[PDB]
Amino acid sequence: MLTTLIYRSQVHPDRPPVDLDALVHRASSKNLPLGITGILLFNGLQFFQVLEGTEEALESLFSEIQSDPRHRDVVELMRDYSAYRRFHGTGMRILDLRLFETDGALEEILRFSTFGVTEPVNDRMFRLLSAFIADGGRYCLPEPLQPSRWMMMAPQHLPGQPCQFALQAIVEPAKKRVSSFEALIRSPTGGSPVEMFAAIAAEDRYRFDLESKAYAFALAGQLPLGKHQLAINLLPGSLYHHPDAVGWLMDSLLAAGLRPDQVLIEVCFDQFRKVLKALRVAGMKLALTRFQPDKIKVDAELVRDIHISGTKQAIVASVVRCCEDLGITVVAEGVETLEEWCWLQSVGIRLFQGFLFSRPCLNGIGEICWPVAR
Amino acid sequence: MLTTLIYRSQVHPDRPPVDLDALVHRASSKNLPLGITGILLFNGLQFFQVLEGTEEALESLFSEIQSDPRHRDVVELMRDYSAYRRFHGTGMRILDLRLFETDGALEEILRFSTPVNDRMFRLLSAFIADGGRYCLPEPLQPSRWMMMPATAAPQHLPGQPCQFALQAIVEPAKKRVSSFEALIRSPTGGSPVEMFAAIAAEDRYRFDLESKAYAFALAGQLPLGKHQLAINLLPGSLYHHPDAVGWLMDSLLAAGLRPDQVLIEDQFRKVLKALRVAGMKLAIDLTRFQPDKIKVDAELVRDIHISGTKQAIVASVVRCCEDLGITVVAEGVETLEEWCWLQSVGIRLFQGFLFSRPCLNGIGEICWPVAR
Ligand SMILES: Nc1nc2c(ncn2[C@@H]2O[C@@H]3COP(=O)(O)O[C@H]4[C@@H](O)[C@H](n5cnc6c(=O)[nH]c(N)nc65)O[C@@H]4COP(=O)(O)O[C@H]3[C@H]2O)c(=O)[nH]1
Ligand SMILES: Nc1nc2c(ncn2[C@@H]2O[C@@H]3COP(=O)(O)O[C@H]4[C@@H](O)[C@H](n5cnc6c(=O)[nH]c(N)nc65)O[C@@H]4COP(=O)(O)O[C@H]3[C@H]2O)c(=O)[nH]1
Ligand SMILES: Cc1cc2nc3c(=O)[nH]c(=O)nc-3n(C[C@H](O)[C@H](O)[C@H](O)COP(=O)(O)O)c2cc1C
Ligand SMILES: Cc1cc2nc3c(=O)[nH]c(=O)nc-3n(C[C@H](O)[C@H](O)[C@H](O)COP(=O)(O)O)c2cc1C
Incomplete structure (x- = not known):
């Protein structure tokens, strides 16, 4: 059964910067045969990942992700069944948000993603993506x-x-x-x-x-x-x-x-x-x-x-x-x-x-x- | 039956400044014989008023206050029955928060008040700390x-x-x-x-x-x-x-x-x-x-x-x-x-x-x- 999992985490600032390149290539290669699609956002201090796939595949992957020493304070935001995949092709997509200005990040996300026949703002996943881009440091x-x-x-x-x-x-x-x-x-x-x-x-x-x-x-x-x-x-x-x-x-x-x-x-009105x-x-x-x-x-x-x-x-x-x-x-x-x-x-x-x-x-x-x- | 009424309001910024000395002295003189007490807080742009008295006296007064053209956007924050009078012997009194350092306004309150476990005081603190939130x-x-x-x-x-x-x-x-x-x-x-x-x-x-x-x-x-x-x-x-x-x-x-x-x-x-x-x-x-x-x-x-x-x-x-x-x-x-x-x-x-x-x-x- 198709499932969406959305989490948020943060890095250790005292340790060397996380290799996003090695992270994304290995993620992409491991996700493809498992039928896992999605996107990863990074703002310098925090990660934000959307994962789409079977319940079995996502429960297994998230356990590895939770236990990963590259990041900490893994905060689960969403976990629900899904009718359709929002993200297509498959490398695990990644955006370094430090390189994007105002609405450029939303524009790149919307390039390859589908959010049904109605406005993307009607999709919870997109709203959560938007809230992290706009103000991700809120619950950091x-x-x-x-x-x-x-x-x-x-x-x-x-x-x-x-x-x-x-x-x-x-x-x-x-x-x-x-x-x-x-x-x-x-x-x-x-x-x-x-x-x-x-x-x-x-x-x-x-x-x-x-x-x-x-x-x-x-x-x-x-x-x-x-x-x-x-x-x-x-x-x-x-x-x-x-x-x-x-x-x-x-x-x-x-x-x-x-x-x-x-x-x-x-402590009947x-x-x-x-x-x-x-x-x-x-x-x-x-x-x-x-x-x-x-x-x-x-x-x-x-x-x-x-x-x-x-x-x-x-x-x-x-x-x-x-x-x-x-x-x-x-x-x-x-x-x-x-x-x-x-x-x-x-x-x-x-x-x-x-x-x-x-x-x-x-x-x-x-x-x-x-x-x-x- | 003692009652407390609290509200916040806003000034008219493009109109000549209201003589607040005249208002408060008139307010204090009218309030005390009617068994009404309390305070007014002023931050330059907003009023915050606590009124204490009977439910009947406050209803009548707040009705005159709501229709007063000297202020606008009157927003009621509290109207509840009350155990005791907090501002005993104070018909009305103004505190200009701009003439106080941090803690200074709150400390002055406590010198003619008659603390954090009381709802009125928390609301006063809220207006002192960040009054312009719902402005x-x-x-x-x-x-x-x-x-x-x-x-x-x-x-x-x-x-x-x-x-x-x-x-x-x-x-x-x-x-x-x-x-x-x-x-x-x-x-x-x-x-x-x-x-x-x-x-x-x-x-x-x-x-x-x-x-x-x-x-x-x-x-x-x-x-x-x-x-x-x-x-x-x-x-x-x-x-x-x-x-x-x-x-x-x-x-x-x-x-x-x-x-x-x-x-x-x-x-x-x-x-x-x-x-x-x-x-x-x-x-x-x-x-x-x-x-x-x-x-x-x-x-x-x-x-x-x-x-x-x-x-x-x-x-x-x-x-x-x-x-x-x-x-x-x-x-x-x-x-x-x-x-x-x-x-x-x-x-x-x-x-x-x-x-x-x-x-x-x-x-x-x-x-x-x-x-x-
Ligand atoms: N006073 C005021 N009312 C406004 C205003 N704007 C909209 N309304 C109204 O509020 C109702 C819509 O709210 P609802 O919570 O869906 O409340 C609806 C909805 O719950 C409902 N209802 C409508 N169709 C169905 C249905 O097919 N099945 C069920 N189970 N309930 C339905 O019965 C309720 C009664 O609906 P309606 O007569 O259509 O009345 C509508 C509507 O005219 C407004 O500005 N002021
Ligand atoms: N009608 C009536 N009800 C009474 C009276 N005395 C106590 N109760 C209540 O019965 C509930 C269960 O209380 P508890 O075994 O003493 O257990 C206490 C307590 O030991 C406990 N507690 C405190 N810290 C923790 C904690 O860190 N973890 C857990 N799991 N429980 C904790 O939670 C409970 C306190 O929370 P409450 O929401 O007050 O929930 C209390 C309170 O409603 C009474 O005289 N009359
Ligand atoms: C923020 C972040 C996102 C990650 N995303 C994925 C991913 O989507 N797919 C994946 O296989 N591993 C991902 N990982 C890495 C896993 O936690 C884990 O290290 C890796 O899957 C182990 O696989 P391996 O046995 O091939 O080494 C991510 C790690 C972090 C820190
Ligand atoms: C911020 C604000 C607070 C006021 N507080 C009082 C008050 O506590 N007591 C009072 O009698 N009038 C108060 N007034 C004035 C009344 O709205 C009203 O103008 C006055 O009570 C009319 O009574 P009078 O004709 O006897 O002067 C206040 C007005 C404003 C703008």
Whole structure:
């Protein structure tokens, strides 16, 4: 089956310039008997390749390409089935973009390529080609943010309580500063939030979720929360199926020595409106045209393998800029590797949550690891 | 009930400078007895104002502010209920950001304010750091543009269980029609709702798919040429038959069209795979999967000229789709004010009554924005 694969990479600037001649001749000779067509673009620092061929042929070729020491930071942009080949003849075609002016590069690409009966701009491949020629250095990883240049650097359980809480830091590595702490519910035997709520009866869950927060607040009050925010998780029903859950939380957090604005609530268009209204007037924080939260948390699945995914990179960069304009805090969660942190920081993330920095800590403030040079 | 209203606006650069000392002193004197507080930021070209008070007091005041000829392009950024007053004992006060070094404006704020965890402060910082981002450029002012017509021949085609209206998706910069959208009509020329209501519930998926033959037939004898064509389809109409994709193929080819010319606006993945293999394009009317086109909803387009939220969402949708290589169309564009602001955030393809009204079985008349 005919498949299109599009990736982007960059060279090592510290090493001798990559031999484009030897690269292209060997590529052309190897691609032809395998039925592989396409084009390679080079701007001095970055490569950009379109590959067309069978799924079997492209999976094999890309593995060799990924593992090639001539380039690094291989970022996959597109991988889809195709109805027709855009590129014809076959040497692997190559353009050194340093030799082309404005629209001369697009003109040479369009010389031998076919993009159907409609305008080439209607083809995703052509648009991606155009974006690299126009602004390829956009998602080019900066030298200070190369992963290889970085490396990484007590309290008891309480079984007698109906529930307990583990605290995880949300950190800002650039200023080596804790931004907030999130309270995460744990069972009396140390189990996860799933295990806890499964041991509670179905008709009792909402009320348990709300009343569990008293233990999180008490934990937060006994710990040195030096003007740090505390985030707590709540089911929509826990706030809604209660006469005054906002007022309940208010009385509970104030009795523990906390302020309204110090507490953030992490979470049905109908029931949420009058609840958020009361939470806002109380002074608590919440985490687009209808309403705006104080914080948006980029999920772990967008964070996972962000260094190789041009889609995930584009989405996260789009979230950062939008939230900046709206005045909404952004936190990337589920950060497990140096690579993820580097790439998330390159697209504008400054606040992080994950096992790389700080693991959840049962009934206390855990230790934080910070990324340092070399 | 305390509320916060934040907006940005722009000066008139070719008119005598507004006496801001007079305005702010008058503002401060009027605001405080009415329980209104806040600040004004000035960067030479733009205003940024935070207003605090009751919902009723701010509505009445902001209404006077919107109709004030001393400024233009008033764009609302925030209107939300508020826990506490941030600018207590400050009716109104101006900060000229040009008289401050970096951090200086923000530090002054914090000395008469009553930080980064607050939305208002982040927005203040955003205007201080890069206020000119959504500053509407001079050649894109609504009054520097006029719509002018470029004739429509609508026809009734009897002997058909359905009809189709065609609406152009246009590219004003190249004065070019990008594609035509097929919109289903009843035999009497009634709405899509009017058409589907005549069809029995169990036959609605079969009818939706098989009605496309008449859309293909219309596009072919037009002739379509080098232009695209949505068709819209229900997901169920694609599952209804195992060779639904193969049937659409046969139908468009028999109408003299190409696969790459046709765009369609669990279970779904297998169909998506079949649509790509065949060569047809797909639109949403992201990591798993990527369409060829996304269409910005009419609600986001409505009042985008006065909504900073909608401005921000659309801009980053545009930028995201640029990086993904996805075509972006703004739908429901009714006014020049909308077109100008969509153009300023990076939209280049447009659909709406401003440009082209849907035309029963034929290519309608198109209007273009021309510079003044
Ligand atoms: N794979 C990975 N995971 C990481 C990493 N860093 C942190 N996590 C984890 O992700 C969860 C916190 O994210 P959440 O979106 O608040 O998701 C939480 C949160 O929604 C939640 N939850 C916690 N406490 C409560 C509660 O009291 N009430 C309700 N309704 N939900 C709660 O249940 C969810 C599952 O929570 P947890 O088992 O405590 O697991 C925690 C946590 O340990 C990482 O680097 N990699
Ligand atoms: N207010 C306003 N409206 C504008 C403007 N410009 C275009 N429109 C309209 O918006 C509709 C096209 O948008 P759609 O999301 O495809 O929405 C369409 C489309 O989803 C649809 N539809 C049309 N044909 C079919 C079909 O064959 N099958 C299915 N399943 N749905 C269809 O039903 C919807 C109703 O379509 P229509 O009556 O044809 O109404 C058209 C159209 O007249 C504007 O500037 N302002
Ligand atoms: C940016 C770049 C593009 C490449 N393109 C191709 C190509 O399209 N075809 C190919 O066979 N090898 C290509 N390679 C080289 C492969 O990574 C690998 O070195 C080569 O295929 C090994 O083949 P061999 O066993 O004949 O030495 C490329 C390498 C780089 C750095
Ligand atoms: C940038 C801008 C900000 C303004 N802010 C206020 C204000 O905060 N309070 C106020 O009363 N008028 C403000 N005005 C002026 C009003 O639009 C309006 O002219 C005035 O309130 C009319 O009331 P008056 O007739 O009593 O002077 C502002 C005008 C502009 C251009």
